[PDB]
From a paper:
Sucrose import from photosynthetic tissues into the phloem is mediated by transporters from the low-affinity sucrose transporter family (SUC/SUT family). Whereas the SWEET facilitators efflux sugars, active loading depends on SUCs that use the plasma membrane proton motive force to drive uptake of sucrose for accumulation, with concentrations reaching as high as 1.3 molar in the phloem. SUCs are part of the Glycoside-Pentoside-Hexuronide (GPH):cation symporter family that belongs to the Major Facilitator Superfamily (MFS).
Here we present the structure of the sucrose–proton symporter, Arabidopsis thaliana SUC1, in an outward open conformation at 2.7 Å resolution, together with molecular dynamics simulations and biochemical characterization. In the asymmetrical unit, SUC1 forms a non-physiological inverted dimer, with both monomers in the same conformation (root mean square deviation (r.m.s.d.) of Cɑ atoms = 0.1 Å). Extracellularly, a short helical region (named extracellular helical region (EHR)), which also has clear amphipathic properties, is present in the loop connection between M5 and M6. The EHR is anchored to the side of the N domain by a disulfide bridge between the strictly conserved residues Cys216 and Cys220. A large and clearly defined V-shaped cavity, which spans approximately two thirds of the membrane plane between the N and C domain, is open to the extracellular side. Overall, the cavity is electronegative, but it becomes electropositive towards the enclosing bottom.
Author numbering: 25 to 500
The structure:
């Protein structure tokens, strides 16, 4: 009960930059790679869905096992190290899938390159398992360093979100820079495109940054070897359970009122966020710029242009995220509580999701005066990018406050940090599958386009604000 200094908590929070780099990398390089491999869109949907499913499975099991690690290296360091090593292996397998597939039998003038697709899928599965092995114990290790100090936990998670934004900016700048392959001239082969070579170079830089921020962090911070308390032969803790739902249901039944209310507020928060976070680039390429991936060559060109402009919007968003993360705790304190700031920024999210309709109206008006395939004006561009920028404020709270509150409640109750966070992750990965599988049908139900999902998400965000301000209990 005597906290490790801030220097070590921030050293542990700094690994989020190296983790987020490897994902932000892929925004403008994964789609051309999927085109190059020729993966059928149904198989692509399955590969993508493997993400949230693996988040459902790995997170609680890893949390429950990390809370009982008993290793000499600590409760959290072994899992983080294993996750980073598996990230390295997954990078190696994803970047080189096309070249192996070619050298193993794939034909150059054949659309569906089978062997390359198999290697690609194995790589992403390893990466999913690695990410879900890493995420839990790292924030749990922050919670261990805080040793019951609520303010220290809040500061730790604010810095975690800050480093996430740092890694996002770095990966967005690398992934969108053509001619990066000039670093390694032999990245381009007969089966590897220029974007493939940029992907390889970005993955090299990813392994580099990850080693840099991880080795130093795990040598620099000591992880305290855990000792289990003595037990009888007739105890539940030395008794086997259901393989996967054992940890989840055990978490749910030792649970408190505050944890239930926090999970509800977080689930509604992510049901609000994921429509935009999943369909924003399509909204930009379709509603805002005009054009479809199908149709005449200009409309395909305009769709590509809209997607690029959306990537720039996300860049602005991450910059704003990083700047807000540094003031989260002070602003929350002066407002009289972190959940107060949560509730307040959720209404900003609601209004921002509402502004989408006005942007779309301005774009159709310009398209009527200047032509259907004339593209947007500078005003429509500026407005869409301003929306992307402003939305960075609530995302900073979403990336910090819920995990900190989970940790504080689990410290008061004694639940266990790793498994509390692994169960909190359900309120993120279940809305993800709901939105990804029901967005299209829901939009079609209400006329088409992207906007109905955005209006329902705005209402959900306002409801999240109300509940965070009223039903969510304050910490002790």
């Amino acid at each position: 009960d005597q906290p490790s200094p801030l220097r070590k908590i921030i050293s542990v929070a700094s690994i989020a930059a190296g983790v987020q780099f490897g994902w932000a990398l892929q925004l403008s390089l994964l789609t051309p790679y999927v085109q190059l491999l020729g993966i059928p869109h149904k198989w692509s949907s399955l590969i993508w869905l493997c993400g949230p499913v693996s988040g459902m499975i790995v997170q609680p099991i890893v949390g429950f096992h990390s809370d009982r690690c008993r290793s000499k290296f600590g409760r959290r360091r072994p899992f983080i190290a294993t996750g980073a090593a598996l990230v390295a292996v997954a990078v190696f397998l994803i970047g080189y899938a096309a070249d192996f597939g070619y050298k193993m039998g794939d034909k150059l003038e054949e659309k569906v390159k089978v062997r390359a697709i198999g290697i690609f899928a194995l790589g992403f599965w390893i990466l999913d398992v690695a990410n879900n092995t890493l995420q839990g114990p790292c924030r749990a290790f922050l919670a261990d360093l805080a040793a019951g100090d609520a303010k220290r936990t809040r500061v730790a998670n604010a810095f975690f979100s800050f480093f996430m934004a740092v890694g996002n900016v770095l990966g967005y700048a690398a992934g969108s820079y053509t001619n990066l392959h000039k670093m390694f001239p032999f990245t381009m082969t007969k089966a590897c495109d220029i974007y493939c070579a940029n992907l390889k170079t970005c993955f090299f830089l990813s392994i580099t940054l990850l080693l840099i921020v991880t080795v130093t962090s795990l040598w620099y911070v000591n992880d305290k070897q855990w000792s289990p308390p003595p037990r009888n032969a007739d105890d539940d803790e030395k008794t086997s359970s259901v393989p996967l739902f054992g940890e989840i249901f055990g978490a749910f039944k030792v649970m408190k009122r505050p944890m239930w209310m926090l999970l509800i507020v977080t689930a509604l928060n992510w049901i609000a966020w994921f429509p935009f976070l999943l369909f924003d680039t399509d909204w930009m390429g379709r509603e805002v710029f005009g054009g479809d991936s199908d149709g005449n060559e200009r409309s395909k060109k305009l769709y590509s242009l809209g997607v690029q402009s959306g990537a720039m919007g996300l860049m602005f968003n991450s910059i704003v995220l990083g700047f807000m993360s540094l003031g989260v705790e002070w602003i929350g304190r002066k407002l009289g509580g972190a959940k107060r700031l949560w509730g307040i920024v959720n209404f900003i999210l609601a209004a921002g999701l509402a502004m989408t309709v006005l942007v779309t109206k301005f774009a159709e008006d310009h398209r009527k005066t200047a032509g259907d395939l004339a593209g947007p004006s500078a005003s429509v561009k500026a407005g869409a990018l301003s929306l992307f920028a402003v939305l960075g404020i609530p995302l900073a709270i979403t990336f910090s406050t819920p995990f900190a509150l989970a940790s504080i409640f689990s410290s008061c109750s004694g639940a266990g940090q790793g498994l509390s966070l692994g169960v909190l992750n359900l309120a993120i990965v279940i809305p993800q599958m709901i939105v990804s599988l029901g967005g299209g049908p829901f939009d079609a139900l209400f006329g088409g386009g992207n906007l109905p999902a955005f209006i329902v998400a705005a209402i959900a965000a306002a409801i999240s604000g109300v509940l965070a301000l009223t039903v969510l209990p304050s910490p002790p």
